[PDB]
């Protein structure tokens, strides 16, 4: 089993200030809503993708499903900012979160998950259909799901991914139904 | 003096009350508003009970009668306690022994009893 | 979507298993 | 015609302490106790379905003088959805003579 | 009125030690007694605090009395705004 | 024996009604306290259950919302007071 | 073992749903409650379930009778649990000075 990657969260400083104006009404697909919220939202559709650009020239990219992809549709959010006569350099990229999800091919039984890791996995049904549990050498987040679905997330690398998989899958496997 | 405190006095004078505490007029308007505020409070669930709107003058009656037996109960009637007095009344006085010292009734009605305490240690 | 889905999986198992067959009593 | 029948009251007593017996004299006060207990409920109810300008006794009414006076819910029973609560209808004169205790008050 | 707790109500008795097929009037004293403590509980937070809202605060202020019921409140809070942090 | 046991823990606490006040009122109720830490038992009730009434109080004063000295007015003792078999009904604007 | 294992799996996963108690509470106020309300809502009818059941198995355990639960010992449940003030009731004014 190996687990794809779902979703990639970046950050990008352009170094210039921003008015928001200007950019909400020259630029396409880009939403300004300042009653709501304090940034420009504008989407791409080559490489589906949205960015929340701020006032102080910083830049928040969602939605990509590679690191070259993030951080190709932040260099298309750069010149596009770019073109409309702002000078916006790359200063600094950096992803902040990536997240990936993956099936492990069988039913599990979360009451013994919880009975014997009690320590590491918050467990409420009422409120989430989901287990919580905690790596704590990883550093990662992962939603158990009783159909066989886990979800990773808070993770700033791949390979965090993919050791964090590799722990739990023995576990998972354990506790089969 | 509002006009149901200069009434309140009236009512005191009228029965055999000519010397009284001034904290009584002020006692006697307080129960005379916990009163019709409790009538009242059974006479708006009792509307709501049969469903009307407003609260009409038969609910008010009913949340009179309906507790005089609960917040104002009575001493017992007068045809009650002569059933009650002529058939104990029937029974003779028994006769008495001559030499018993202290006449009690048994044990269990007393309040002879050893009375204990707690060892104050 | 996935919590949409998996939300309704803690209760179709909590109508097959607990109350098969229904009494009653005198 | 009598309701209560000193072996249901016999086991009444065995269900909370199995050890114990009534004397006769507990046990009469006890079933003169349960029918007065009946009449008095059974009168206050006819009294609040002869105001529902009915003829019926429901279990709506027996519920009702239960809990204001008796303090006793029973629970299998079930009722109509009891409507929205209606919290304040406070009149417009005790808007205006409580808008005058204030008024010497403070000012 | 129908019963609109019949289903969810048999998972409960047998989760508390019931058996796993309880009687039917049973689970519906168990139902009007979860409807009349809903009520009573409405009733009681729409005349403490604000009147005429029922909020949070309210049901906190009412069920304090009483350790276990006190307990659940609090945990169940503090989970969801703990989930909605991962989220 | 948890009333034996309490009576222990109790000889620490000093109750704030004095003992010849409770002693002065299980006089009118029909005994005179011989042992003093029966009076003490029944001192701390009482003390318990005043405390209660008033934090009672103190927490409607305080959910209203004025958050510098709260004032024990009738407002917020009369709702407090019916929680417990306490209930009082003063009347206003006598017409 | 393997039925305490299915004992605690409806312990956990039981609850009352959002939607009927949503629709429930705001037939009583009258305009509208909040999600967080709700969650406490139907948090605390699972404790109180969970208090008369829990002493429910207590009235059939003092009595000689088995685990299937008879209506005789879930009246008997609302009558100890009341007595121990655990069961309130906004319709009686009550008195305890007389």
Partial sequence: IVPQLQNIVSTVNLGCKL?????????????????????????????????????????????????????????????????????????????????????????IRLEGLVLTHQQFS???????????????????????????????????????????????????????? | ????????????????????????????????????????????????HAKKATVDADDVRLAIQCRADQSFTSPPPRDFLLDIARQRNQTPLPLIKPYSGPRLPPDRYCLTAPNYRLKSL | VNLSEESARILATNSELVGTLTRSCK | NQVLTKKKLQDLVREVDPNEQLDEDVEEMLLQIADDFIESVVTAACQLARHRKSSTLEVKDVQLHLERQWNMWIPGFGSEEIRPYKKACTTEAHKQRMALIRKTTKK | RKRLFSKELRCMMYGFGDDQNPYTESVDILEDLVIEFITEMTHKAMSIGRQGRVQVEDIVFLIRKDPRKFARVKDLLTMNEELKRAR | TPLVDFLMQLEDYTPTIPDAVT?????????????????????????????????????????????????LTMEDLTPALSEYGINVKKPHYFT | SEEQLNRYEMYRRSAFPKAAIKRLIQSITGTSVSQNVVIAMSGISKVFVGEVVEEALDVCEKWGEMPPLQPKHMREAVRRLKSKGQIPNSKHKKIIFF
């Fill in chain 1, 19 to 107: 008015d928001l104006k200007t950019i909400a009404l020259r630029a396409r697909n880009a939403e300004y809503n300042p009653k709501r919220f304090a940034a420009v939202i504008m989407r791409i559709r080559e490489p589906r993708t949205t960015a929340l650009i701020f006032s102080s020239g910083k830049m928040v990219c969602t939605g990509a499903k590679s690191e070259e992809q993030s951080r190709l549709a932040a260099r298309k959010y750069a010149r596009v900012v770019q073109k409309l006569g702002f000078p916006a350099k790359f200063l600094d990229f950096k992803i902040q979160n990536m997240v990936g999800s993956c099936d492990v091919k069988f039913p």
């Fill in chain 1, 122 to 177: 918050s467990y409420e049904p009422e409120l989430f259909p989901g287990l919580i549990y905690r790596m704590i050498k990883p550093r990662i987040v992962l939603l158990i799901f009783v159909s066989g679905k886990v979800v990773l997330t808070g993770a700033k690398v791949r390979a965090e991914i993919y050791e964090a998989f590799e722990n739990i899958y023995p576990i998972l496997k354990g506790f089969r139904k």
């Fill in chain 2, 1 to 48: 003096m509002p006009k149901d405190a200069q009434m309140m006095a009236q009512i005191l004078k009228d029965m055999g009350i000519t010397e009284y505490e001034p904290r009584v007029i002020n006692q006697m308007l307080e129960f005379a508003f916990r009163y019709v505020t409790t009538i009242l409070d059974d006479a708006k669930i009792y509307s709501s």
């Fill in chain 6, 23 to 71: 002693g002065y009122y299980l006089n009118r109720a029909g005994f005179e306290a011989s042992d003093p830490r029966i009076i003490r038992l029944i001192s701390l009730a009482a003390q318990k259950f005043i405390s209660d009434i008033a934090n009672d109080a103190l927490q409607h004063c305080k959910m209203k919302g004025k958050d510098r000295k709260y004032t």
